[PDB]
Paper text:
Like all members of the Picornaviridae family, HRVs consist of a T = 1 (pseudo T = 3) icosahedral capsid of about 30 nm in diameter that is built from 60 copies of each of 4 coat proteins VP1, VP2, VP3, and VP4, protecting a plus-sense single-stranded RNA genome. In HRV2, a member of the minor group HRVs, upon binding to lipoprotein receptors (LDL-R) on the cell surface virions are taken up into vesicles and directed to early endosomes.
Analysis of the electron density confirmed the absence of VP4, as predicted from comparison with the poliovirus uncoating scenario and the cryo-EM structure of HRV2 previously determined at 15 Å. Externalization of N-terminal residues of VP1 in the empty capsid is compatible with the lack of ordered electron density up to position 1062 (VP1, VP2 and VP3 proteins are numbered starting with 1000, 2000 and 3000 respectively). In the structure of the 80S particle, the density within the pocket is absent and the cavity appears collapsed. Surprisingly, the 80S empty particle possesses pores or breaks crossing the capsid shell. These pores, absent in the HRV2 native virions, connect the canyon floor with the internal surface of the particle, close to residues Arg1062-Glu1068. Altogether, these changes disrupt 13 interactions of the native capsid and produce a break in the interface between pentamers that crosses the capsid along the two-fold symmetry axes.
Residue numbers in the entry:
A (entry chain 3): 1 to 237
B (entry chain 3), C (entry chain 3): 1 to 60
D (entry chain 2): 14 to 261
E (entry chain 1), F (entry chain 1), G (entry chain 1): 62 to 283
Write the structure that this text describes.
Amino acid sequence: GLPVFITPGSGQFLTTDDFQSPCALPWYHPTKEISIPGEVKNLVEICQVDSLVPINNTDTYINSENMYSVVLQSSINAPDKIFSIRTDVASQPLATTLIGEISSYFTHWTGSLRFSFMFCGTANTTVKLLLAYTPPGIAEPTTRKDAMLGTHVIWDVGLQSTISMVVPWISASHYRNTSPGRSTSGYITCWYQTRLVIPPQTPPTARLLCFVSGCKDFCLRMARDTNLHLQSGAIAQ
Amino acid sequence: GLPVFITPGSGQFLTTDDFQSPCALPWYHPTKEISIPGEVKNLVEICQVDSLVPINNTDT
Amino acid sequence: GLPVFITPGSGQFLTTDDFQSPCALPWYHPTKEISIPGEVKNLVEICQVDSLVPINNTDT
Amino acid sequence: IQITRGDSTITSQDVANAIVAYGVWPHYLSSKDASAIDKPSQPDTSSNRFYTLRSVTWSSSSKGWWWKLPDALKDMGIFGENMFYHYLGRSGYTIHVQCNASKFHQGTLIVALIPEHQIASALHGNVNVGYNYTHPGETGREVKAETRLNPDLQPTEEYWLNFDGTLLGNITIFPHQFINLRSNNSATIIAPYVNAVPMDSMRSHNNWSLVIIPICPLETSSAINTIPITISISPMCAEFSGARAKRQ
Amino acid sequence: RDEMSLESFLGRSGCIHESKLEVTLANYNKENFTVWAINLQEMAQIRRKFELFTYTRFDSEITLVPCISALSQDIGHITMQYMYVPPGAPVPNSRDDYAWQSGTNASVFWQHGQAYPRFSLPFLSVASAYYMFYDGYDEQDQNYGTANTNNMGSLCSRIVTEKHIHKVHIMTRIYHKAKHVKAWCPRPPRALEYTRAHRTNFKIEDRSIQTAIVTRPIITTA
Amino acid sequence: RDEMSLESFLGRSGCIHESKLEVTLANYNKENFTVWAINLQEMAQIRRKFELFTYTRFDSEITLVPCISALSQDIGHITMQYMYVPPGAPVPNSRDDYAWQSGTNASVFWQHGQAYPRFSLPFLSVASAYYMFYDGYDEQDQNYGTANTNNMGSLCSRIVTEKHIHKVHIMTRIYHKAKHVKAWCPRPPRALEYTRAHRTNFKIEDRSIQTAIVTRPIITTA
Amino acid sequence: RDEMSLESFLGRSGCIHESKLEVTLANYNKENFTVWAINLQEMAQIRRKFELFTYTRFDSEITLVPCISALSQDIGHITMQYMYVPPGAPVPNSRDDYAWQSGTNASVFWQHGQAYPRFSLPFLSVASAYYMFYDGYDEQDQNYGTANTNNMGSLCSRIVTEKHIHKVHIMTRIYHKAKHVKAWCPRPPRALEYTRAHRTNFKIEDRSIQTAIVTRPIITTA
């Protein structure tokens, strides 16, 4: 009939192939589709959702909602530096957040992240927090001064319980490896510009929340298996 | 001749497949068809026919 | 389906062949290309570059 | 302002800065999606009003609360009866969570509406959650330390794990709203019906599940150191099918 | 963002089930046939991925990789019969049950040295999607969590040859691939080990709850 | 309603006949060949389906699935010859009968490791349809029920190789598939067990007539 | 000059790696799997050719040539599984590691008598080209010369069958072919023997530096 020449690779089963295959139920007409709200089409949709960062991941608060908040003091003797976290999507604490989890399912990432903060204090409690970003390459600041000498924000809580700041994408290559780096990672440091000021008969302390999501330019490439979930159990039915 | 690549599934016999096959009697011209009354084309035709329900299905 | 005739040479692996092959990472979008100076396209480019001849190739 | 819907009317709802679950507004079942070809009509504004549950007490030790819909409203006048005297039904809601506090109170709540919120059982082994405990009614389910009965039937108490093995703090992937006392004191969520079928047995399947976790503990210097959380739910485009004789 | 599409994330093929069959001499029928209720929740990695959404819909591509092993006495040529039994149809319970020759079921015969078998299945549920989670109960108000509309059928296999049987082992890796995928209502990722199929249960006996969150000594030092 | 079309209901393939052939040493010819008169009434399930109509017409697709089993002494390579003898043509009665090389018959050779044989047959009757039922008699006024125009021919098989024969068993499942189906005059479904081929007989010895109708104690309670 | 194009010079296929696997009886898992980090610098001839440029970019075509050798006791039918693990993904470390069934990796199954396996890989680096040379250092200021962006993944292989294992040897020649090649910044050809991978080191112990330059007695006589 028609002269054909078989090519190297024929008959092989490549788990990542893409060919047609006979339908086992050719006559069956599948149930119609209906309108279910919330269709997701791209994982980026999930990455742009702010999720709480377990900022206070110490042994004391490890398995409680307290691992998601930091306690701000009003006493004059609390250390200037409040908390610090690396900016690599896959590094702790970010790792276990929404964007962190989806990122752990890929090998290359790129883009900017958006950190948002919420002051869980009283309506009369005011304070000035210094939120500073440190580019990759240099070790995180050690004093309020050094911190404000770099890029930062003097956030005045009274009158605005929320604020966001965008960490830019600074890298040699277009996309960077999904695995956490220390010398190749940035830092987010929070400092007391002033302590908590409050009127009489008011809680001397207040909590602080931290959120994170990717921006429009956030993107992932080359899927791998997440390492945030290790299954070593029965899974008995 | 023409470069081809064999796909997973080739040579298999899927009982629900649908492919052509050589005619064993290529020259034979089958008896013509005539008009027989009552052609059925869909089982729904049979389902729309009222039938008695054995309503009194007791042992008696 | 479509009558085919296998030609002598099928299934062989000729190290100098030229056929397509399934991509193992079909979804992966490779890093964009940037402008690196000095692209070479033909070895003749290298042959037209004067180079010193070891004219005095003695043991000394 | 005040949203008056039916013979019920709740004050303090104000502007419309509420969230609309998954961006879809509650709608009546379209004939195209309908199960039994189409039904002549299903227009009934009778079940569309505000049912206000008893206010729950938020103390400095409160860990969380959750209700399941439609379950919570199984005993709420018309809606309740309707879902009891019909085989199938579908409905959207307008949940309205608000708490009374002063500028001298501080705290934060996460009010999330979770679809198909399949709870996890408390114990280890081959156990499962029992019907009675996932259908607490309007009373809801409070996170307690006390020991309960049919323990192997009881659902988990691990609120920080969203009661289902996921991490609280990722719970924001569901339609939600934060209630930061020093900013807002109420949240509102308008959710449409969500399921893989047009209608269902309201008795056996709870589509939505309203969860309320205090992410930032309540603190205050007032005499009574606790505030109330009031919840008002209003059915949206409720539809029913397979009606049966009542009062029989 | 093309690689971040559902098709790319869930549409990859993975081994959803390992099926071993051993030739037994005592009785011809015995339990030589193997029956497995199709379920994509058996593999944790695969499960966690799908459980990222509440509802999913998709077609399937099953590929079979048979691995024959002969301890001794040749028996090189054997014919295998893999059969797919649709949801609701009766499953075989003997190597010679009638099910094996029924025309409503789909079967594919494979004799060693043949290309790996492969076939497709359309969206099977009676609902418009598969439930990844179900806050509902049975009709008996029991077995809460699992959904009956989610049934996908069974994969069966029997050795067709007769006496050439010399106690040989048969391993059949079953690869599944979700095609034309659609998902609804994203949920947070599973943070703990799975313990049961069709249940979000996570508590393990005499073991502390362990998350992916790694603890540090002080929060001022990243 | 597409799946409720005749093509969907009767057009599915099923195993209409199992054909076993065993190597016998005494005589080369013996009865090594196997002859089977094509008949779709042998399998109850398949029969009841077709007997849902009075007259049917359709083309056929025969697929052969050979299963060789070697007890011992190798003999791995053997060539099989399947032959189709049209209605009215003489059937073979020896492994070396002339019929096997005749050109009016259709034969297909199969050697293990080859794709399963398959061929098509056109509507064979001399009438315009096959009779599912026949309220008539023979020309001798006997054998009432069966119709002569309904003959479809025979499927034959012989081992072609010569002495490499070391007493090996051959199983050949024959799959048939009705194509381009047409049916006339629907009839009620068969309610009892079949007892004879080509006869509606239903009475079984020393056994009560048993229907599909399940009895209940009282008609006021469903 | 068409044959002097980069495509012609570097685009030819060559054996970049020899992979031997031997059946070991002590433990089923053992180290039966084989893992190799893809590297085109292992073969001097191939290396010198590429090292003619500073930066290169290209897609790849891997072809596998399996050579089975049975010392005794048959075991003729065995199924091989070759797997490609992308850069950064975890590599298997046991014959039954989970990696072998993961869907993010690419696997190809080969059973003897089948066409040689073959698949393609796109440009893998996170940079815009592969570095043939690197006047740079590690992040730790160590291992200068090698570039991390140059990682190309790993080729793994395991015997899939179970007990039919009768101590047989498996040789797998891996052929690679650079496709759609591009190169930048030509460099002089390597004049000495290579001594290390990823290092221009040339000094060999107790041996004089030997070039390709042949010496003559007098320069007035060609």
